[PDB]
Amino acid sequence: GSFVEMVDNLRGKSGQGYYVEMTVGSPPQTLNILVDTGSSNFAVGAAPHPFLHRYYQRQLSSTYRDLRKGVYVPYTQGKWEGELGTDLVSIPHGPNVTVRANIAAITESDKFFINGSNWEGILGLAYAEIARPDDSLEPFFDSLVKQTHVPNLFSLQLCGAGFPLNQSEVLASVGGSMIIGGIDHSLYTGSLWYTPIRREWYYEVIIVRVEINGQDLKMDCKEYNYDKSIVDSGTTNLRLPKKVFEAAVKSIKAASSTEKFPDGFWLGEQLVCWQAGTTPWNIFPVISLYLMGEVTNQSFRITILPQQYLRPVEDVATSQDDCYKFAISQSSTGTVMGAVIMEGFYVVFDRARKRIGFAVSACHVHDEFRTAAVEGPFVTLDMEDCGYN
Amino acid sequence: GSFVEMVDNLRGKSGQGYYVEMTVGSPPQTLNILVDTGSSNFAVGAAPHPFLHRYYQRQLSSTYRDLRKGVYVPYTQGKWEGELGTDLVSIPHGPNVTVRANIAAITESDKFFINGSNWEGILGLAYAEIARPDDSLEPFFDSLVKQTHVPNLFSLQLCGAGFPLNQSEVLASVGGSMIIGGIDHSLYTGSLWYTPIRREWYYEVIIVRVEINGQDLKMDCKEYNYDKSIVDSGTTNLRLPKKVFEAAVKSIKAASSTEKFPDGFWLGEQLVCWQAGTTPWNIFPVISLYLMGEVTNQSFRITILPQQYLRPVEDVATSQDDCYKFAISQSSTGTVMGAVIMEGFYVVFDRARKRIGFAVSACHVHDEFRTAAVEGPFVTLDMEDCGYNI
Ligand SMILES: CCCN(CCC)C(=O)c1cc(C)cc(C(=O)N[C@@H](Cc2cc(F)cc(F)c2)[C@H](O)[C@H]2CN(Cc3ccccc3)CCN2)c1
Ligand SMILES: CCCN(CCC)C(=O)c1cc(C)cc(C(=O)N[C@@H](Cc2cc(F)cc(F)c2)[C@H](O)[C@H]2CN(Cc3ccccc3)CCN2)c1
C-alpha cells in the first residue's frame, strides 16, 4: 500500500514530458528517460545531438550485446532511427532489480529530442503488438516482469505545477511518481474506478459519453473512439478525432462566450494571458469523459477542469501575467488522453487484470470552487457499440 | 551561339575545380584562376608554393598599386592570408576589356592550393556582402560592370567528362565555358527556367520540394534551405543539411537496394568500381530539386542523374574498371549545389534581374535511357515559408 522508495521519482512537465532516471550498461551509465505509455520501444540517444549533454556509449559497456539489426520508429510527430542491442538496465528509484532488456541506440533523429527537457531516451510502456520492428522485440516492462517477481502493474501520478516552471525550477521540482509493481494510497483521494483495456496494444479504452459542463456533446459514441482511444503520457494534449474536436470546441466556446479569444488560441498555437491571479477559471467549463466500467451496462466518469486543459506557459515578455495555451487538439488517429488529462488523476495500468484505474490525484490543480472527480456508477447501454472496428 | 570567343574557355574537373585564364599587371602576367560562385574575393598566389609553378609578381607590374592592408579568408575548408592591392586585369578568352580590380596577393595558405589543379588563384564571383575584410572591397565582377559596358550577367557551363582524365588529358581537354556578359544558346537544349536570387550575398536560392526517383522526400521545405541554399562552383559535391542528407541517403539506398555498398561509399570517402562499361546506372535514382519560380505559386524542377552525383575517379590500381565516389555530402552550413550538380546544367547568373536560370547542359553526361532535365511549371504554395530566417 506504500512504496516510499518510488514516490516522487519523476520530474518534468506536460509540455516536455515526464521522465524517470535509469541506468544502462556496466559500469552503469545514468540517463533520464521519458515515461511513455503511448509506445513500446525502449530507446536512448547513442550519439551526439545538440539537445543532449549525455548519451549511451555502447563501447563503454561490458554487458552490451549487439543484435546487428536496425530499427526505425516514426511517432505521431517525431521519429528516430537506431541500432538494436541488449544490456543490463536498472531504475535507481524503482524496484531493487536489474533486467536485461532490448535497447534501441538512437543514431539519427528528427524532432524527437526536446531542447531543455533533460531526458535522453524514451521508455515505451505499451504492448509488444506495437513495438518496432515487430512484436518479437520484447518491451521493457515485459522483460521486467518475466525476469523478476515484480507484479505486472505500474501506476502514474503526473503532477502539473499549475504555473510555469523555469529552467532551474523544473530541474529541481518533483514532477510526480511512477510506482512500479503497485499502488501507493498516498497519491490519490477517493475511490479508484476501472475501465477495461479493450485490447493489449496501446492502452486502449472506450469512451461512452462526453459532457461539457454537464451538457451532453450528443454524438454517436463510436465517434469518440474513432479509430481508437488511448491513455498516453507521451503526448501533451487531449487529442480528439476531427468531428469530436469540432463539436467540443464549439461547446467550450459557447460556455466561455463572455470572453472572446483569437482563432490561434483555439488552434492550440497561441497563448492567452491575464493579469496575475485573475485567470477567469469559472467562465471555462469542466469536461467529463465517461468510460466503460468493469460491470455490464455500467460506466463511470472522470471530470477535468480548465486547470487541466489550459496549459501554463511563460509569457513572451516574461511578464507577471498568468498565461496558457489551449491543450486540446484535433487528431486523425483517434482520441489521445494525454499528459494534461493524466495530471488530474492517479492512473493505474493494471496489466495483470487488463484494466486501467483512475482516481482523483492528490496533486491535481484546482480552485476553491471546483475539483477534478472520478465518479460512478452510471447505467449505460450497448457500450461495446462505442468501440470502433 | 553568339559568344564564340568565350565558348570552351574553361578547363579542369569537379574534384579540382574549373578555371579560366586571366592576366594581371603590366606587362600582363598569365595565371589560371578558379571560377568560384561561392565566394567574393579575387586572390592569386603571390609567393612560391610547392603546388604552384607560377605566381603574381607585383614588383614586375608597373600598374600595381599597394593598398597597404592585409586580408585573411577562411573558406568552408582551406584558408589563405594575403596583401591587398589593385592592378589591371583581363580575360584572354573573355570580353575584350581591361579593368582595374582589387587583388589579394596570397603570401601564406593552408590546404588551399591543390596539387595538379593547374590553377594559381581564385575568382570569387558572388556579392560584396561576403567579401573579406568587408563589403567595401569591391568584387571583380562589380568592377568589371562598373568600368565597362559588359552586361551584369555571366553564365557557366561546367563539363564533366563522365570518366577519369589523367594529368595530360585534363590539361588538354575543354572543361566548359564561362560566358561573361551574356547567354550562349549553343550551350544548352530545351528552355531556361529562372529561380529568384533570394538575397545578394551568396547566390542564394530556395528549394521547395525534393524527389528521389519521383518519390517525395517529404520534409518541411524549410529543412532543405537550413540555413541557406546556394549555387557554388567552388565546391565539388552537392552538400545537404544534416537531416536532409540522412533522409536522402536513406532513400537513395532504398532505390539502389539491389546492390549493397559499404558505409565508406555513402560517406563519400571510398570509391566503388565496376568492370569496364558495366556501371549499373539504372539502379541509381534520379534526384529532382524543385526551385521557386518567378511567378507566384509556381515552381520548376531540375533533375540530375547518377552520372552527375557519382564522380568518376581513377582506380587505386589504375585498372580498367570504371570507378566513382558518391558526390553528395552532409553540410552544417546549408545546401550547396556544387560542381557535380552544375555539370548537368547551363547556369545563368542573371545579376541584372536578380535571378538564376537553369537549362539542360549540351555537355551533361547521360545514357540512352535517361537524361538530365529542367521542367515546369508546377503549382507550389507558400514557397516563401521554405526560406530560413535566423
Ligand atoms: C511536440 C513534441 C512532443 N510532444 C510534447 C512532449 C510530450 C507532444 O505533445 C506530442 C504531440 C503529438 C502530435 C504527437 C506526439 C507523439 O507522437 N508522442 C509519442 C511519444 C513522443 C514523445 C516526445 F516527447 C517526442 C516524440 F517524438 C515522441 C507517443 O508514443 C505517441 C506515438 N504514436 C505513434 C506510434 C504508434 C505505435 C508505436 C509507436 C508510435 C501513438 C500514440 N503515442 C507527442
Ligand atoms: C577539398 C578541396 C576543395 N574542394 C575540391 C575542389 C573544388 C571541395 O570540393 C570543397 C569542399 C568543402 C567541404 C569546402 C570547399 C570550399 O570551402 N570551397 C570554397 C572555394 C574553395 C575552392 C578550393 F578549390 C579550395 C578552397 F580552399 C576553397 C567556396 O568559396 C565556399 C566557401 N564557403 C565559406 C565562405 C563564406 C563567405 C566568404 C568566403 C568563404 C562558402 C561556400 N563557398 C570546397
UniProtKB/Swiss-Prot annotation, chain B:
Reported tissue expression: Expressed at high levels in the brain and pancreas. In the brain, expression is highest in the substantia nigra, locus coruleus and medulla oblongata.
Catalytic function, reaction form: Broad endopeptidase specificity. Cleaves Glu-Val-Asn-Leu-|-Asp-Ala-Glu-Phe in the Swedish variant of Alzheimer's amyloid precursor protein
Glycosylated residues (UniProt): N96, N115, N166, N297
Segments in the Extracellular topological domain: 1-390
Keywords: Acetylation, Aspartyl protease, Cell membrane, Cell projection, Cytoplasmic vesicle, Disulfide bond, Endoplasmic reticulum, Endosome, Glycoprotein, Golgi apparatus, Hydrolase, Isopeptide bond, Lipoprotein, Lysosome, Membrane, Palmitate, Phosphoprotein, Protease, Signal, Transmembrane, Transmembrane helix, Ubl conjugation, Zymogen
PTMs per UniProt: N-Glycosylated. Addition of a bisecting N-acetylglucosamine by MGAT3 blocks lysosomal targeting, further degradation and is required for maintaining stability under stress conditions. Acetylated in the endoplasmic reticulum at Lys-69, Lys-218, Lys-222, Lys-228, Lys-242, Lys-243 and Lys-250. Acetylation by NAT8 and NAT8B is transient and deacetylation probably occurs in the Golgi. Acetylation regulates the maturation, the transport to the plasma membrane, the stability and the expression of the protein.
Residues modified to N6-acetyllysine: K69, K218, K222, K228, K242, K243, K250
GO biological process, one term: amyloid-beta formation
Activity regulation comment: Inhibited by RTN3 and RTN4.
Impact after mutating D227N: Almost abolishes beta-cleaved soluble APP production
Top-level division of the source organism's lineage: Eukaryota
Enzyme Commission number: 3.4.23.46
Topology of this chain in the membrane: Single-pass type I membrane protein
Claim: Ubl conjugation is one of the keywords in the record: yes
Domain Peptidase A1: from-to ranges: 18-359
Cellular component terms per the entry's GO annotation: axon; cell surface; dendrite; early endosome; endoplasmic reticulum lumen; endosome; endosome membrane; Golgi apparatus
Active site, UniProt feature: D36, D232
Induction: Up-regulated by the Ca(2+)-regulated transcription factor NFATC4.
Residue pairs linked by disulfide bridges in the UniProt entry: C159-C363, C221-C386, C273-C323
EC category: hydrolase
GO molecular function annotation: amyloid-beta binding; aspartic-type endopeptidase activity; beta-aspartyl-peptidase activity; endopeptidase activity; enzyme binding; peptidase activity; protein serine/threonine kinase binding
Subunit structure, as described in the record: Monomer. Interacts with RTN1; RTN2; RTN3 and RTN4; the interaction leads to inhibition of amyloid precursor protein processing. Interacts with SNX6. Interacts with PCSK9. Interacts with NAT8 and NAT8B. Interacts with BIN1. Interacts (via extracellular domain) with ADAM10 (via extracellular domain). Interacts with SORL1; this interaction may affect binding with APP and hence reduce APP cleavage. Interacts with NRDC AND NRG1.
Family designation: Belongs to the peptidase A1 family.
Function as written in the Swiss-Prot or TrEMBL entry: Responsible for the proteolytic processing of the amyloid precursor protein (APP). Cleaves at the N-terminus of the A-beta peptide sequence, between residues 671 and 672 of APP, leads to the generation and extracellular release of beta-cleaved soluble APP, and a corresponding cell-associated C-terminal fragment which is later released by gamma-secretase. Cleaves CHL1.
Domain remarks: DXXLL motif is required for a proper endocytosis and retrograde transport to the trans-Golgi network, as well as for regulation of lysosomal degradation.
Name of the molecule in the record: Beta-secretase 1
